[PDB]
Amino acid sequence: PHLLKKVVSEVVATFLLVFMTCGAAGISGSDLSRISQLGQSIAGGLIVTVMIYAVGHISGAHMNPAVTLAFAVFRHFPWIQVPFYWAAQFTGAICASFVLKAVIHPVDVIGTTTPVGPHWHSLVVEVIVTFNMMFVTLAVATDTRAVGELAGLAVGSAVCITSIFAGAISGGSMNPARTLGPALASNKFDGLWIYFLGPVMGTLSGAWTYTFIRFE
Amino acid sequence: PHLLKKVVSEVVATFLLVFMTCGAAGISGSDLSRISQLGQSIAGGLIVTVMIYAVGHISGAHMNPAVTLAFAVFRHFPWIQVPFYWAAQFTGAICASFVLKAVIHPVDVIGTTTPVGPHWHSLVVEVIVTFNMMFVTLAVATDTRAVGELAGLAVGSAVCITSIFAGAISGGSMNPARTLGPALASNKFDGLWIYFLGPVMGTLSGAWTYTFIR
Amino acid sequence: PHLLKKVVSEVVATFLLVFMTCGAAGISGSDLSRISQLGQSIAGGLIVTVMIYAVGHISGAHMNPAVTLAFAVFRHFPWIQVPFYWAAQFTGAICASFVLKAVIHPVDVIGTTTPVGPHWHSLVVEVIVTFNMMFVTLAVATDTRAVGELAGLAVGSAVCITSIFAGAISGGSMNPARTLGPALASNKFDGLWIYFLGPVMGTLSGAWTYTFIRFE
Amino acid sequence: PHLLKKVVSEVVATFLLVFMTCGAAGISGSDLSRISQLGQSIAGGLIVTVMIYAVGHISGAHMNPAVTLAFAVFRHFPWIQVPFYWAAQFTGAICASFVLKAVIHPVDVIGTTTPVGPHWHSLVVEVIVTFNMMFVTLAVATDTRAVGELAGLAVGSAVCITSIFAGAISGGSMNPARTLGPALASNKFDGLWIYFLGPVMGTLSGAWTYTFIRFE
């Protein structure tokens, strides 16, 4: 039901998503005098917001398979469309990290999200922060799909918190599509089981938690 | 009046409040290479803002026993409900910091708030900056409770100012539930009373100053 | 004309203005490990924003003698009230820096807006950056007086631009009330005229420029 | 069609645009002790946001000839006015960077935008970050011209992201008038062509991508 412009918007968003979000964390993860560490989180959070303004009213700016999933679980999102977005997201992302592999000549750690210390630390973090994000994503979404000025602020804000804090433990992802892309350009795949089960379990738990308390 | 979903909202918010705000101040106060010092202030303000968008229209997104007190005094909040939130906040906070003592294993100062100079520095700050916070919280609440896009911007900003400045003196808390959780998940109960009297005297004073200039 | 509650809002705002903006600038300019330098800009701009949300609909959130003057000149504000407000701003600032002198014992330059090198560098910056403020302050004012969600964003943002850049040259004040407060509790009185001729001459010029382009 | 107030509004912005975005980038680009590296990215973004609040409803706050262009191709902007804004931007930029040359006397690199590595690195960034900017500029435009509270947040956000990331590769400009202004104020012209193809080739690309996904 009008899924072409939805998926072009979902790919073009996920590309500019990953291209920006890793390219500052990857560059920063190679010279912190070149791009600040708080600067790679702020950059990563701002970019989520502007894609909600760009494609939020068209596709919904899902950009996140564990979110497209969470919408299909809780607010009636077309199950016949979730494969098309999942596809659309993984594509724009994986494409980007390679596009940067070439634009950031010296550095070949393109924002790897790899667990720090005990691998489970990340999982508890990657569910609590993903829960957090999906929780607020759901309290602000308008069902065309995550639309509007404050939807951009809420989700971008949540995401930014994740880079600052969950970045010290998990690297801070919450998005199976965005760990995978970079993991391929730098061939480091340490702990990927957590960047699927943290999120999928984080979005569904947090989304479920919202529908619980839903009306006042 | 329909308080089950309200107190679930007040724990899940105060938990997510402390979990990120302390989880980042705890990591940061251990390796400033691992999390920035300005990043743990920003973290503190953003989490308040997004929690206002998520539970603000349901519970009121108080996430603070010294505020639920302050609204019940001035802007008609249910007194049979203030024990019930105090329960929800002190819980979600105490619950949160413990989840972190473990999730940030090796670091065990779980973002606590303890005075820096003479304790009255903190107490005077923890009333002036807390006076500040409740002041604007009260000017933007619409009474369902602290709800709406700019309600989140105001409070998040206020909290963010507090981490930066009151962080140098008091640690910048303004929230008794957020002090106990951490003070308990590790230890140190240093100045624990100013983080109970600074706030309660700060939120009530700040609310009264606004209700005056209405 | 109903000026009683109007002027209390202007001291509590100007007090809370300086208590944070100087109280963080004073600590920070002393141990840059104790409070970040980017953190002292962000702090100072945020506080302007929250005061505009607090008292903007009551007083207008002037907090600035170069503002109350400029509103009195261009968007018809009461001359019977410009003295009563000018009082409220010079007080809340002077009171705060002293209230700070004690809460921050070891540090005793309680914020300083003091020129860097050539004094004319500061006066030129202190009118152009002050031009920035009054220009936008006027484009977003609703005349009850600087009211509304984006009034807080516009002005708060502008002030933050000033701390970052004009902080490197002048210290970034734009405020006759804000220079006096710290200069009295810190007891450093350099260039005090540029913080009266920079501001007073900067806002009047910037307001005139908005009233000029007023139409599209 | 009522262009006097329109072009005076376009210069005063581009003056205050460059005066601060470079005045902080230059001061920062010398002594990072006097202005932080993230502070000159943030400042670069706040100024775009507040200028949209000041002149967005009058001229539209393009502040960018490659953007003033980008609107003429896609959302019907007066070709008899494209010269008059181009003039206005190239003017206010060149004038401002000179105003600072003198106001920051011992430091005389007045916030230049100069490439880093392979010049194609810089250019490839200056189109995708410029693509990003124009893409969202288009999803939030209201046509009098880029007006409104969230219009400022998106555009300023796009700019702030670019300074963080594209500053590490291209210097992060996306604006031919803003590369020229500083380049003249202290003699520097390396890769000046990417800052004329990065933008022009970048804004047009980003706009078309939205007009594609125009609907839902």
Tab-separated table of N, CA, C and O in Angstrom, chain B residues 214, chain C residues 1-7 57-60 62 76-85 143-145:
chain	number	residue	atom	x	y	z
B	214	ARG	N	2.184	34.685	39.615
B	214	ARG	CA	1.165	34.207	38.647
B	214	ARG	C	0.344	35.279	37.927
B	214	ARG	O	0.569	36.478	38.068
C	1	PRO	N	1.655	50.029	35.998
C	1	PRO	CA	0.569	49.230	35.419
C	1	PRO	C	0.722	47.739	35.737
C	1	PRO	O	1.131	47.005	34.831
C	2	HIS	N	0.383	47.302	36.962
C	2	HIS	CA	0.526	45.894	37.386
C	2	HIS	C	1.996	45.467	37.384
C	2	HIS	O	2.351	44.364	36.964
C	3	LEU	N	2.843	46.321	37.940
C	3	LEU	CA	4.287	46.146	37.898
C	3	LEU	C	4.850	45.395	39.091
C	3	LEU	O	6.042	45.060	39.088
C	4	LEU	N	4.031	45.126	40.105
C	4	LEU	CA	4.546	44.474	41.302
C	4	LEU	C	5.079	43.083	41.000
C	4	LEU	O	6.284	42.829	41.114
C	5	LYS	N	4.205	42.180	40.563
C	5	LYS	CA	4.669	40.837	40.248
C	5	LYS	C	5.656	40.846	39.092
C	5	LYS	O	6.516	39.962	39.019
C	6	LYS	N	5.598	41.875	38.241
C	6	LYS	CA	6.458	41.923	37.069
C	6	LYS	C	7.917	42.021	37.475
C	6	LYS	O	8.773	41.316	36.923
C	7	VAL	N	8.209	42.838	38.484
C	7	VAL	CA	9.599	43.094	38.862
C	7	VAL	C	10.194	42.004	39.782
C	7	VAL	O	11.398	41.733	39.718
C	57	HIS	N	6.316	35.146	30.068
C	57	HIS	CA	4.944	35.592	29.979
C	57	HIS	C	4.546	36.561	31.085
C	57	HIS	O	3.491	37.195	30.969
C	58	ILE	N	5.378	36.744	32.112
C	58	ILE	CA	5.047	37.653	33.210
C	58	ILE	C	5.771	38.977	33.014
C	58	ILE	O	5.140	40.018	32.791
C	59	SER	N	7.093	38.954	33.146
C	59	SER	CA	7.894	40.152	32.975
C	59	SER	C	8.258	40.402	31.526
C	59	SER	O	8.460	41.557	31.127
C	60	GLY	N	8.331	39.343	30.737
C	60	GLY	CA	8.974	39.377	29.453
C	60	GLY	C	10.329	38.739	29.467
C	60	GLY	O	10.916	38.535	28.399
C	62	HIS	N	13.238	39.998	30.730
C	62	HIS	CA	14.226	40.949	30.233
C	62	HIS	C	15.617	40.641	30.788
C	62	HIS	O	16.543	40.356	30.022
C	76	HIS	N	7.267	49.410	22.236
C	76	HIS	CA	6.446	50.240	23.154
C	76	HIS	C	6.436	49.801	24.635
C	76	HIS	O	5.380	49.686	25.256
C	77	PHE	N	7.577	49.588	25.212
C	77	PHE	CA	7.399	49.122	26.597
C	77	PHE	C	7.381	50.300	27.592
C	77	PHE	O	8.061	51.304	27.364
C	78	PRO	N	6.562	50.235	28.738
C	78	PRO	CA	6.450	51.375	29.685
C	78	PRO	C	7.716	51.972	30.307
C	78	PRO	O	8.376	51.358	31.157
C	79	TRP	N	8.072	53.171	29.825
C	79	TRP	CA	8.960	54.118	30.505
C	79	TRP	C	8.632	54.390	31.972
C	79	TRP	O	9.554	54.706	32.721
C	80	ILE	N	7.390	54.227	32.442
C	80	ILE	CA	7.212	54.305	33.895
C	80	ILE	C	7.760	53.061	34.572
C	80	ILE	O	7.947	53.056	35.792
C	81	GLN	N	8.069	52.023	33.793
C	81	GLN	CA	8.498	50.727	34.295
C	81	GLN	C	9.940	50.369	33.949
C	81	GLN	O	10.476	49.431	34.550
C	82	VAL	N	10.548	51.016	32.941
C	82	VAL	CA	11.972	50.780	32.659
C	82	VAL	C	12.870	51.081	33.854
C	82	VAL	O	13.860	50.360	34.043
C	83	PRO	N	12.619	52.102	34.690
C	83	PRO	CA	13.434	52.193	35.911
C	83	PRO	C	13.151	51.060	36.883
C	83	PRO	O	14.092	50.449	37.403
C	84	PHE	N	11.877	50.725	37.108
C	84	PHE	CA	11.565	49.678	38.078
C	84	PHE	C	12.153	48.322	37.668
C	84	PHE	O	12.504	47.519	38.543
C	85	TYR	N	12.281	48.048	36.351
C	85	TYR	CA	12.942	46.816	35.901
C	85	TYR	C	14.469	46.928	35.942
C	85	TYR	O	15.143	46.006	36.416
C	143	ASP	N	5.359	40.159	22.863
C	143	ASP	CA	4.917	41.330	23.623
C	143	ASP	C	3.960	40.953	24.754
C	143	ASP	O	2.930	41.603	24.961
C	144	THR	N	4.331	39.869	25.473
C	144	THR	CA	3.906	39.523	26.826
C	144	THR	C	5.012	38.885	27.693
C	144	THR	O	4.697	38.320	28.744
C	145	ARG	N	6.310	39.010	27.377
C	145	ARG	CA	6.868	39.994	26.486
C	145	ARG	C	7.815	39.271	25.485
C	145	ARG	O	7.679	39.430	24.278
